[PDB]
Design a protein around this motif. Structure first.
Motif, short mmCIF file in Angstrom:
data_model
loop_
_atom_site.label_atom_id
_atom_site.label_comp_id
_atom_site.label_asym_id
_atom_site.label_seq_id
_atom_site.Cartn_x
_atom_site.Cartn_y
_atom_site.Cartn_z
N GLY G 34 -10.88 8.04 13.02
CA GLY G 34 -9.62 7.34 13.22
C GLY G 34 -9.58 6.00 12.51
N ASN G 35 -10.68 5.25 12.60
CA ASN G 35 -10.78 3.97 11.89
C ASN G 35 -10.71 4.16 10.38
OD1 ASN G 35 -10.89 2.46 14.19
ND2 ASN G 35 -13.07 1.98 14.06
N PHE G 36 -11.38 5.20 9.87
CA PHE G 36 -11.32 5.51 8.44
C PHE G 36 -9.91 5.88 8.00
CE2 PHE G 36 -16.03 6.31 7.76
CZ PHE G 36 -16.14 5.40 6.73
N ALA G 37 -9.22 6.72 8.77
CA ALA G 37 -7.87 7.14 8.41
C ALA G 37 -6.88 5.98 8.47
CB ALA G 37 -7.42 8.28 9.32
N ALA G 38 -7.00 5.13 9.50
CA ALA G 38 -6.13 3.96 9.62
C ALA G 38 -6.37 2.99 8.48
CB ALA G 38 -6.36 3.28 10.97
N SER G 39 -7.64 2.76 8.13
CA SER G 39 -7.96 1.89 7.02
C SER G 39 -7.50 2.48 5.70
CB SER G 39 -9.46 1.61 6.97
OG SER G 39 -10.19 2.80 6.82
N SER G 40 -7.51 3.81 5.56
CA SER G 40 -7.01 4.44 4.35
C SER G 40 -5.50 4.26 4.20
CB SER G 40 -7.35 5.93 4.35
OG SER G 40 -6.41 6.67 5.11
N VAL G 41 -4.75 4.42 5.30
CA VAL G 41 -3.30 4.21 5.25
C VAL G 41 -2.99 2.75 4.92
CG1 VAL G 41 -1.20 4.22 6.63
CG2 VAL G 41 -2.77 6.13 6.77
N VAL G 42 -3.70 1.82 5.58
CA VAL G 42 -3.48 0.40 5.36
C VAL G 42 -3.86 0.01 3.94
CG1 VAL G 42 -4.41 -1.86 6.03
CG2 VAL G 42 -3.56 -0.30 7.77
N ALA G 43 -4.96 0.57 3.42
CA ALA G 43 -5.40 0.29 2.06
C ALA G 43 -4.42 0.83 1.03
CB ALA G 43 -6.80 0.85 1.84
N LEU G 44 -3.87 2.03 1.25
CA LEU G 44 -2.84 2.56 0.36
C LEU G 44 -1.62 1.66 0.34
CD1 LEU G 44 -1.75 6.27 -0.07
CD2 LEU G 44 0.00 4.61 0.17
N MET G 45 -1.14 1.25 1.52
CA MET G 45 0.06 0.42 1.59
C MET G 45 -0.16 -0.93 0.91
SD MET G 45 1.77 1.21 5.30
CE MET G 45 0.35 0.82 6.30
N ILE G 46 -1.28 -1.59 1.21
CA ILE G 46 -1.55 -2.91 0.63
C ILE G 46 -1.79 -2.80 -0.87
CG2 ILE G 46 -3.35 -4.69 0.56
CD1 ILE G 46 -3.37 -4.49 3.65
N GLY G 47 -2.53 -1.78 -1.31
CA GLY G 47 -2.79 -1.62 -2.73
C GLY G 47 -1.55 -1.28 -3.53
N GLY G 48 -0.69 -0.41 -2.99
CA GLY G 48 0.57 -0.11 -3.65
C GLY G 48 1.50 -1.31 -3.71
N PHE G 49 1.57 -2.08 -2.62
CA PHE G 49 2.39 -3.28 -2.60
C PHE G 49 1.90 -4.31 -3.61
CE2 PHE G 49 2.55 -7.65 -0.88
CZ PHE G 49 3.91 -7.88 -0.99
N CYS G 50 0.58 -4.56 -3.63
CA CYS G 50 0.02 -5.54 -4.56
C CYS G 50 0.18 -5.09 -6.00
CB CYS G 50 -1.46 -5.77 -4.23
SG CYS G 50 -1.76 -6.79 -2.78
N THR G 51 -0.04 -3.80 -6.27
CA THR G 51 0.14 -3.26 -7.61
C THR G 51 1.59 -3.40 -8.06
OG1 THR G 51 -1.63 -1.68 -7.15
CG2 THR G 51 -0.24 -1.25 -9.06
N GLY G 52 2.54 -3.03 -7.20
CA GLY G 52 3.95 -3.20 -7.52
C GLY G 52 4.36 -4.65 -7.68
N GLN G 53 3.62 -5.57 -7.06
CA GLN G 53 3.85 -6.98 -7.33
C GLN G 53 3.33 -7.37 -8.71
OE1 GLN G 53 6.21 -7.24 -4.69
NE2 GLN G 53 5.76 -9.26 -5.55
N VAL G 54 2.27 -6.73 -9.20
CA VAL G 54 1.73 -7.11 -10.51
C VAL G 54 2.05 -6.13 -11.64
CG1 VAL G 54 -0.11 -8.60 -9.66
CG2 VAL G 54 -0.51 -6.16 -9.87
N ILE G 55 2.90 -5.11 -11.42
CA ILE G 55 3.25 -4.19 -12.53
C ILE G 55 3.97 -4.89 -13.68
CG2 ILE G 55 4.75 -2.23 -13.12
CD1 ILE G 55 1.98 -1.47 -12.13
N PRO G 56 4.99 -5.76 -13.46
CA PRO G 56 5.40 -6.55 -14.64
C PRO G 56 4.41 -7.69 -14.89
CG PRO G 56 7.16 -6.37 -12.98
CD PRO G 56 5.89 -6.02 -12.31
N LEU G 57 3.28 -7.34 -15.50
CA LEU G 57 2.17 -8.27 -15.66
C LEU G 57 2.53 -9.40 -16.61
CD1 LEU G 57 -0.83 -8.66 -14.80
CD2 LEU G 57 -1.44 -7.50 -16.93
#
Ligand code: CLA
Ligand code: CLA
Ligand code: CLA
Ligand code: CLA
Ligand code: CLA
Ligand code: CLA
Ligand code: CLA
Ligand SMILES: CC1=C(C#C/C(C)=C/C=C/C(C)=C/C=C/C=C(C)/C=C/C=C(\C)C#CC2=C(C)C[C@@H](O)CC2(C)C)C(C)(C)C[C@H](O)C1
Ligand SMILES: CC1=CCCC(C)(C)[C@H]1/C=C/C(C)=C/C=C/C(C)=C/C=C/C=C(C)/C=C/C=C(C)/C=C/C1=C(C)CCCC1(C)C
Ligand SMILES: CC1=CCCC(C)(C)[C@H]1/C=C/C(C)=C/C=C/C(C)=C/C=C/C=C(C)/C=C/C=C(C)/C=C/C1=C(C)CCCC1(C)C
Ligand SMILES: CCCCCCCCCCCCO[C@H]1O[C@H](CO)[C@@H](O[C@H]2O[C@H](CO)[C@@H](O)[C@H](O)[C@H]2O)[C@H](O)[C@H]1O
Lengths: 101, 162, 107, 732, 33, 30, 90, 108
Positions: G34-57
């Motif tokens: 459960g901790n792994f799955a929750a961290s995976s969801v949170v990591a996907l959301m944070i990584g996608g958000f941060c990436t979308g913040q830096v896509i117009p590099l």
């Protein structure tokens, strides 16, 4: 004596310096270099071919081959020098007979 | 190799000492003959049309060996032919360059051999080591100062030669 | 001196009709180098009718040779003693094959 | 006789075969008499030290011979007009006209004109005089001496490493990734930022002033401040004259993309940020394996755990750890394969994206560099497969590899070889058919009937990189794409300017001739792979010889029985694949050179119209460009190309000599040698002289190797003379 | 060329004396018992 | 340009490398 | 031939069952699914958000979003570990 | 059969001699022309290899009509010497001279 005497001729008549005034000197020097190379060949042949034996009166012994090599060197130098002297002093030998024409 | 007198042997030390004593003599005589201008046409540049492509040096002017250098080399060629004949066909009494496999090596003389003056092997070895050291010293004094070797000899002998 | 000899004509299929070159004499074909034109001129052949008759003679001799092969293997085969006559074969082939052949061609 | 002291069997051979086989097995240490694993590894370590010293001595010799006899200081001032000198010529066999004709480069003595490109490389990295060239040569002499001493030292007792040190995979991987790859790249980035870029901007930086000449006016304060983008501000202007301050910038780390408009090479600041980023990435890679401190990965655990649970790979990668660590031939095959791929990559990417100033205008140098590294690549790939076959013969233990990936390769080797055979026959049948079809239909005067396939896949790839030639309008060639908008602020202007200007070799335009020659290349690669893979997988045995592993990697045959067994060993498959490797590098280099020669001439349509049929290759590339090469000497005179004119013929000779060892075989030559032995024994004044070794004919494998060597040397020398002399005659 | 005597000194030595001595000593080494 | 002394220094370094190479070759030959 | 060395603590992790043992997760061997799955969801959301913040590099990217963008490939290994722990009864 | 070794050994030696002193002349000429030494080549403007025997035979065959074949009007072939027989402005047959190159290729 025989081989070193005849070795001067082709080097003198056909070498790269054959059309120069120092053609005979260059030919004799080339013959001397060939003689030294062949003496080194004789020496290494005798080193690898013969065991050290007391017998020294035969060609196919170590001491006998060393004696033969020494004689061949001295004879080759002497014969080449004799050919050099004769061609230097006789115009018939310089032109290979064309001085008669 | 080592069983024939080659390498670090007393035979090789004696032979190199003899050649070095002769070399000191030849350098002194070269300095003397060059200082007095006794080498004929010493600055004449040898031409390729007479002596062939072996005379080419590719310097900045002339592209040929000087006549003095060729004369010095021919003087060395004489004693090189003597060297080859003495190495292959030595005199019966003469010391040989290469020794037989079952030979008795001469004992090393240590710091200094016994002080036998005259035409003794001890005096030969002493003056030979001295001449080899002198060649080393003359070369080092020539390359650490830029003085030519003939000039370095002429200053070290106090301008006696020229 | 101005007509290139040519005795092969190609059919037009895939553009290979380009090989029917302009060989002179109002003719298009593949130039031939076997030297048959010069042989026929030396033999005195002046018309193509004579060449037709020569072709017929060659065909008849081809039929005669193939019949002779069938006859002399399958019907009347010579024995080994017949083949082992070197002297008679040399006499007949020197005087009759080469000699009479040279004589008739000289004729 | 004690020359092969490592082989008692060879030392007792009474014939001339002893010398040849002692020469040919000298570095095959695993087969030597009484060889242990520890001694083997220690000898290999010292030999590797010696090869490193050889490399350093060779590089120091290049540097020294340039600093002494070159014209580097003249070439630095005028890089596009002065011919670079490799070394001086002193050959006493020259006549005077040859002395005159080789006196080039602005000097007064005969010289060879350098084709290696060391001038452009050394000038780009900041060398300006002959003094720093000489200093680099001295440093590399010292480094070679250091590595020779290290090779001697690490063989001395109490310094010989143990087998546990040699088989320490994790420590060597961590140190070689983080330090040998990472820190070396970071230090090279430091050299570019600290030395090369200031010398490119007209400022001298040497050991005497590099601690007081800052690479950037702000110093390391933006780096320690986290304001790293300050290092990207004020890049070099498009008016920058290389090696001078005119138009120079102050940036040290940029991502500009494209080429410097004057040098036609990549921006040095881009190269510095590249090597810095590569260093950081590799140092992060080099902290991955566990060595002494609990953290890090275990290689054995990674290998054993990656078995797919569907069971299609069997036991997965179980046992591969011990199989690879215990086999030096597995390691050598992997290393040679990866090196061959990367030197092919070097050859493609260095012509396409040159990094050295003014080297894109040196056509002879570009041709020589591409040809050189591609032939090196072919040799390395053949070696990778050969040493893999040697691993299967000598080091593969089936019981240690039960249901492994290696075992399953061996279990479907027949499918692998049959499908390689099918794809080779497929490619060859239809590629040769299209070429012959085009040849026949052009010969019959109808070139419009040719089968000309446009290479739309690779053109689509070019358009995806931004090439607007084909009108595909996708990815970087579309002005509204997300890929276009993503990179628009960083590298897209410079890259788009470089890819859409037809003045470089960046994604050169391609047509049907390019299509055909890449499919011919695909044929040649698949066929060479077929020979090599079939040799490696049948190395242990076949239906004709089920006990082949008992006979080793190399043996002549198994006799005329069972139908005849000529060339049945895996070594013979290496021998057969060498010809195919020569053929494929020949096709690749022919394509590269003809395309580039037609482009440089401004006559690319000649390649576009003539490359679709073989007669175009024979006439417009081989016959047409041979004219200055074969006129290097003629009955009217000679010029500087004469040496290549000699070497060309030289190659055509020795190649043909190779044929003699590959067509005529042993028994004929043995009977001739028997007659010669009788003649010498019965001739007076010559039977006084006796051989010590009995004269014999060369052995079967030895003759195959010698014919291969003469063939390969003829191949290389012929093409090298042709490519250098043809490019020199047309353009130089 | 600076030190122009060095090619004419070293090229004959390296090309004729070095291979002759190497071939002689290698011959002695490979033929001795 | 390069002087005679610099070439002599390079030759001395090469001679040192020759001695070290001979020692490594003798060590590898056992 | 000679013994092939491994780092200390190297165990046998070869598996033929449905899932690997938890030891293949190394230091994460004791984390519940459960901790792994929750961290995976949170990591996907944070990584996608941060990436979308830096896509117009740009030439001045935000370092925080650059660091957070690396959680997007981390989330893949996280959901694989979640599956492993879920099928290991954890 | 009983002196096959002598036959094959002498033939082997003469083949090596012919190969050296025929093809090495071409190799020597390649090197001399490449080295810029035209006076060191084997050529008609250089060190000459005259095919004197074949030239002498050609002279005999040219001199033969009226001398050793007294009832022949012309030579057996104009390749030995004589006039240029031309038909339709093209040479039917003319003398075929023999020089150094002809020497080298006949010994090849
Ligand atoms: C070959 C024998 C030899 C001869 C004849 C001379 C002779 C001379 N040397 Mg001399 N020297 C020699 C060997 C010799 N040296 C050696 C082996 C060295 C060591 C390398 C020197 C080092 C030397 C120096 C440094 C100087 C001389 C100087 C002199 C001159 C005056 C001083 C004197 O009497 O020297 C006394 C003897 C000795 C110094 C050594 C013996 C004189 C003509 C001086 C001079 O005026 O030179 C221009 C001077 O400054 N010499
Ligand atoms: C394909 C790439 C790859 C993969 C799959 C792995 C995989 C792994 N590596 Mg490795 N590594 C790699 C590349 C890779 N590495 C590279 C390239 C390097 C070096 C440059 C390293 C260097 C390295 C080292 C040095 C080490 C590893 C270790 C590990 C293991 C640790 C697993 C883990 O992090 O669990 C950790 C578990 C978690 C992170 C779970 C999260 C815990 C909770 C759920 C947090 C979430 C809470 C909440 C939801 C979030 C909000 C929090 C908020 C309130 C603050 C794992 C097997 C370690 C190991 O065990 O070695 C075997 C180790 O020591 N690696
Ligand atoms: C870094 C690269 C590398 C290394 C270390 C080796 C090392 C080796 N190879 Mg290999 N090889 C390589 C590249 C390499 N090769 C390449 C590029 C090819 C393709 C041309 C080959 C083709 C090849 C074959 C076909 C064979 C070897 C063999 C050998 C072994 C002995 C070599 C020998 O006796 O020659 C000594 C040569 C000299 C002393 C002449 C100098 C040795 C383990 C041989 C062997 O014994 O393996 C069983 C063998 O049969 N290799
Ligand atoms: C130009 C020379 C040439 C050609 C065409 C081939 C062709 C072939 N080689 Mg090959 N080879 C060559 C030189 C050549 N080799 C040399 C010099 C060596 C070094 C010894 C090798 C070594 C070698 C090895 C080691 C291997 C091959 C293989 C192959 C085959 C697969 C590659 C291919 O294109 O398949 C397509 C086939 C062809 C292009 C062949 C031509 C087919 C013709 C055009 C069809 C038409 C026939 C025609 C109608 C017949 C009419 C005759 C009648 C009128 C009398 C193929 C048969 C491999 C193999 O067998 O793969 C299955 C393999 O393992 N070869
Ligand atoms: C197995 C055969 C084979 C091989 C090894 C190659 C290899 C190559 N092709 Mg090629 N190609 C092939 C078959 C093959 N091709 C066929 C059959 C066609 C259709 C005519 C093409 C059309 C083609 C184009 C248009 C281009 C390439 C290009 C290339 C190169 C780059 C890779 C690529 O685009 O892959 C392409 C290959 C495939 C997508 C599939 C190949 C494998 C399958 C199994 C082929 C079988 C097709 C089948 C018989 C037809 C199906 C029935 C159909 C009639 C409905 C590379 C050299 C490019 C190039 O030249 O770059 C410079 C390029 O632009 N290829
Ligand atoms: C890199 C090696 C090398 C070098 C430096 C030379 C140098 C030379 N060659 Mg050459 N040569 C070589 C390789 C080499 N060659 C090879 C490989 C071949 C075979 C293809 C030839 C074939 C060849 C021929 C066929 C000829 C030359 C000639 C010459 C000379 C040029 C013309 C001249 O002025 O001579 C003037 C010559 C002299 C003044 C005589 C010099 C005599 C020397 C100094 C004696 C040396 C003795 C010996 C080497 C002592 C050591 C023995 C020891 C190694 C065992 C010159 C000495 C020509 C020549 O003149 O030959 C003499 C000539 O005819 N060469
Ligand atoms: C161009 C290729 C080539 C060359 C050079 C040779 C050369 C030779 N073949 Mg050969 N052969 C070849 C292709 C070739 N073959 C092929 C393709 C086949 C396949 C069927 C054969 C089949 C074959 C048979 C079956 C026989 C030969 C024989 C011979 C020898 C003839 C004697 C001769 O001419 O001596 C003179 C030597 C040469 C012309 C070789 C070139 C040497 C030139 C003159 C330069 C020499 C320079 C010098 C050595 C430089 C030294 C430099 C130093 C650094 C080493 C000779 C060694 C016969 C033989 O050995 O008996 C006599 C024989 O019976 N060959
Ligand atoms: C001088 C030179 C030569 C001479 C010479 C001699 C043979 C060379 C000098 C040689 C000796 C062998 C050098 C001594 C080294 C001893 C070490 C380095 C010091 C160790 C403490 C010769 C003979 C060629 C004549 C030449 O016209 C002049
Ligand atoms: C032509 C003939 C007809 C056809 C058949 C045929 C037989 C094949 C053919 C023969 C062809 C061949 C076989 C002809 C035979 C040929 C050979 C080559 C003749 C060699 C003679 C050597 C002598 C002159 C050197 C003598 C030494 C002198 C006196 C030295 C004094 C020296 C000594 C050391 C002491 C110091 C002073 C000096 C000066 C240094
Ligand atoms: C026989 C022998 C016996 C046992 C030992 C042995 C040595 C192991 C063996 C030999 C094995 C032999 C030696 C094997 C030799 C093998 C060959 C040479 C390996 C080549 C691999 C290419 C890889 C997959 C890179 C591919 C590029 C792909 C991923 C890219 C995609 C994308 C990238 C990222 C970027 C953009 C482009 C696109 C396309 C979009
Ligand atoms: C403790 C938690 C936070 C730790 C953060 C540590 C950050 C990294 C520290 C950097 C190294 C030490 O940095 C400290 O000495 C450097 C010595 O060159 C100084 O650097 C100074 O001198 C350099 C060399 O001449 C110049 O290029 C710099 O422009 C100048 O700033 C730093 O201004 C100073 O802060």
């Amino acid at each position: 004596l025989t081989h070193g005497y005849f070795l001067v001729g082709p080097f003198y008549k056909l070498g790269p310096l054959r059309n120069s005034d120092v053609a005979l000197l260059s030919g004799f020097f080339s013959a001397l270099g060939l003689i030294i190379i062949l003496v080194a060949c004789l020496t290494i042949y005798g080193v690898v071919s013969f065991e050290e034996t007391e017998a020294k009166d035969q060609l196919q012994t170590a001491k006998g081959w060393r004696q033969f090599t020494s004689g061949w060197l001295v004879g080759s130098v002497g014969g080449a020098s004799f050919a050099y002297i004769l061609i230097s002093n006789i115009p018939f030998l310089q032109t290979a007979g064309m001085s008669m024409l | 190799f080592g069983g024939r007198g080659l390498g670090v042997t007393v035979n090789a030390e004696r032979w190199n000492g003899r050649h070095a004593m002769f070399g000191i003599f030849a350098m002194v005589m070269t300095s003397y003959m060059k200082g007095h201008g006794l080498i004929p046409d010493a600055d004449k540049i040898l031409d390729v049309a007479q002596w062939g492509s072996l005379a080419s040096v590719w310097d900045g002017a002339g592209n040929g060996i000087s006549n003095e250098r060729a004369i010095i080399l021919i003087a060395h060629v004489h004693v090189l032919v003597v060297s080859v004949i003495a190495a292959v066909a030595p005199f019966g009494f003469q010391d040989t360059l290469v020794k037989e496999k079952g030979y008795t090596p001469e004992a090393p003389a240590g710091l200094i051999p016994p002080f036998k003056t005259g035409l003794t092997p001890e005096a030969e070895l002493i003056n030979g080591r001295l001449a080899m050291l002198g060649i080393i010293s003359i070369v080092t004094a020539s390359v650490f100062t830029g003085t030519p070797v003939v000039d370095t000899i002429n200053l070290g002998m106090g301008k006696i030669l020229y | 001196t101005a007509v290139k000899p040519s005795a092969q004509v190609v059919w037009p299929i895939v553009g290979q009709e380009i090989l029917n070159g302009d060989v002179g004499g109002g003719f298009q074909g593949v130039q031939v180098t076997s030297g048959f034109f010069q042989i026929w001129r030396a033999s005195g052949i002046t018309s193509e009718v004579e060449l037709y008759w020569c072709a017929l003679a060659g065909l008849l001799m081809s039929g005669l040779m193939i019949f002779a092969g069938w006859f002399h293997y399958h019907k009347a085969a010579p024995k080994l003693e017949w083949f082992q006559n070197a002297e008679s074969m040399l006499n007949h082939h020197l005087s009759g094959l080469l000699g009479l052949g040279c004589l008739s061609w000289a004729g | 006789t004690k020359f092969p002291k490592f082989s008692q069997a060879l030392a007792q051979d009474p014939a001339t075969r002893r010398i040849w086989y002692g020469l040919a097995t000298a570095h095959d240490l695993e087969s030597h008499d009484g060889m242990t694993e520890e001694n083997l590894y220690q000898k290999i370590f010292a030999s590797h030290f010696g090869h490193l010293a050889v490399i350093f001595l060779w590089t120091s010799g290049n540097l020294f011979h340039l600093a002494w006899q070159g014209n580097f200081e003249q070439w630095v001032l005028n890089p596009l007009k002065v011919k670079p000198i490799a070394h001086a010529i002193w050959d006493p066999h020259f006549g005077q006209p040859a002395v005159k004709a080789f006196t080039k480069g602005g000097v007064s003595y005969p010289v060879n004109i350098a084709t290696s490109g060391v001038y452009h490389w050394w000038y780009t990295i900041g060398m300006r005089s002959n003094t720093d060239l000489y200093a680099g040569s001295l440093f590399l002499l010292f480094l070679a001496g250091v590595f020779l001493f290290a090779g001697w030292l690490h063989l001395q007792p109490k310094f010989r490493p143990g087998l546990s040190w040699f088989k320490n995979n994790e420590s060597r991987l961590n140190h070689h990734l983080s330090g040998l790859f990472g820190f070396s790249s970071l230090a090279w980035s430091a050299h570019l930022i600290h030395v090369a870029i200031p010398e490119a901007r007209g400022q001298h930086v040497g050991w005497d002033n590099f601690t007081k000449v800052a690479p950037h006016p702000a110093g390391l304060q933006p780096f320690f401040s986290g304001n790293w983008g300050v290092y990207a501000a004020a890049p070099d202007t498009t008016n920058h004259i290389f090696g001078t301050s005119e138009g120079a910038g102050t940036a040290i780390l940029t991502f500009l993309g494209g080429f410097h408009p004057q040098t036609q090479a990549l921006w040095l600041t881009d190269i510095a940020h590249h090597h810095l980023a590569i260093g950081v990435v590799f140092i992060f890679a080099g902290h991955m394996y566990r060595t002494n401190w609990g953290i890090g990965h275990s290689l054995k655990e990674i290998l054993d755990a990656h078995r797919p649970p569907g069971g299609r790979l069997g036991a997965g990668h179980k046992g591969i750890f011990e199989t690879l660590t215990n086999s030096l031939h597995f390691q050598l095959g992997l290393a040679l394969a990866s090196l061959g791929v990367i030197t092919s990559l070097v050859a493609q990417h260095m012509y396409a994206l040159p990094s050295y100033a003014f080297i894109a205008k040196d056509y002879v140098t570009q041709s020589a560099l591409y040809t050189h590294h591609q032939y090196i690549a072919g040799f390395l790939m053949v070696g990778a497969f050969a040493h893999g076959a040697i691993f299967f013969v000598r080091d593969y233990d089936p019981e240690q590899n039960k249901n492994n990936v290696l075992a399953r390769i061996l279990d479907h080797k027949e499918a692998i070889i049959s499908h390689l055979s099918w794809v080779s026959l497929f490619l060859g049948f239809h590629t040769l058919g299209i070429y012959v079809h085009n040849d026949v239909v052009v010969a019959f005067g109808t070139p419009e009937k040719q089968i000309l396939v446009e290479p739309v896949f690779a053109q689509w790839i070019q358009a995806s990189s931004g090439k607007a030639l084909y009108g595909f309008d996708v990815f970087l060639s579309s002005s509204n794409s997300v890929a276009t908008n993503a990179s628009s602020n960083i590298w897209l202007p410079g890259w788009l300017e470089a890819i859409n200007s037809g003045k470089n070799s960046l994604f050169l335009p391609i047509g049907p001739g390019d299509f055909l020659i890449h499919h011919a290349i695909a044929l040649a690669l698949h066929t060479t792979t077929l020979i090599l893979v079939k040799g490696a997988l049948d190395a242990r045995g076949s239906k004709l010889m089920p006990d082949k592993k008992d006979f080793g990697y190399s043996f002549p045959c198994d006799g005329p029985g069972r139908g005849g067994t000529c060339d049945i060993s895996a070594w013979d498959a290496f021998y057969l694949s060498m010809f195919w490797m020569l053929n494929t590098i020949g096709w690749v280099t022919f394509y590269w050179h003809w395309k580039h020669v037609t482009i440089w001439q401004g006559n690319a349509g000649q390649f576009n119209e003539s490359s679709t049929y073989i007669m175009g290759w024979l006439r417009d590339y081989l016959w047409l460009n041979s004219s200055p090469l074969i006129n290097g000497y003629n009955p009217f005179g000679m010029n500087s190309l004469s040496v290549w004119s000699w070497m060309f013929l030289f190659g055509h000779l020795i190649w043909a000599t190779g044929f003699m060892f590959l067509i005529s075989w042993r028994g004929y030559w043995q009977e001739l040698i028997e007659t010669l032995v009788w003649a010498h024994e019965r001739t007076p004044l010559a039977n006084l002289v006796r051989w010590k070794d009995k004269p014999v004919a060369l052995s079967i494998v030895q003759a195959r190797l010698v014919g291969l060597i003469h063939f390969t040397a003829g191949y290389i020398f012929t093409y090298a003379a042709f490519v250098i002399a043809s490019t020199t005659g047309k353009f130089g | 060329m600076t030190a122009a005597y060095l090619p004419s000194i070293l090229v004959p030595i390296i090309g004729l004396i070095f291979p002759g001595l190497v071939m002689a000593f290698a011959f002695i080494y490979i033929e001795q018992d | 340009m390069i002087s005679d002394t610099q070439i002599f220094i390079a030759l001395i370094l090469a001679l040192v490398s020759l001695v070290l190479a001979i020692r490594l070759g003798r060590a590898l030959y056992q | 031939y000679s013994p092939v060395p491994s780092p200390e603590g190297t165990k046998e992790v070869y598996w033929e069952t449905k899932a690997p043992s938890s030891d293949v997760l190394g230091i994460g061997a004791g984390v519940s699914s459960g901790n792994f799955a929750a961290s995976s969801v949170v990591a996907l959301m944070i990584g996608g958000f941060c990436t979308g913040q830096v896509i117009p590099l740009t030439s001045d990217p935000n370092p925080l979003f650059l660091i957070g963008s690396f959680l997007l490939p981390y989330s893949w290994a996280l959901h694989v570990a979640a599956w492993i722990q879920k099928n290991n009864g954890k | 059969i009983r002196h096959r070794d002598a036959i094959i050994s002498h033939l082997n030696w003469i083949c090596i001699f012919l190969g050296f002193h025929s093809f090495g002349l071409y190799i020597h000429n390649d090197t001399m022309r490449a080295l810029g030494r035209t006076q060191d080549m084997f050529s008609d403007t250089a060190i000459q290899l005259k095919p004197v025997f074949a030239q002498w035979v050609q002279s005999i065959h040219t001199l033969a009509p009226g001398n050793t074949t007294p009832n022949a009007l012309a030579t057996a072939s104009y390749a030995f010497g004589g006039d240029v027989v031309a038909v339709g402005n093209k040479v039917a047959m003319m003398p075929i001279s023999l020089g150094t190159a002809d020497f080298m290729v006949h010994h090849i």
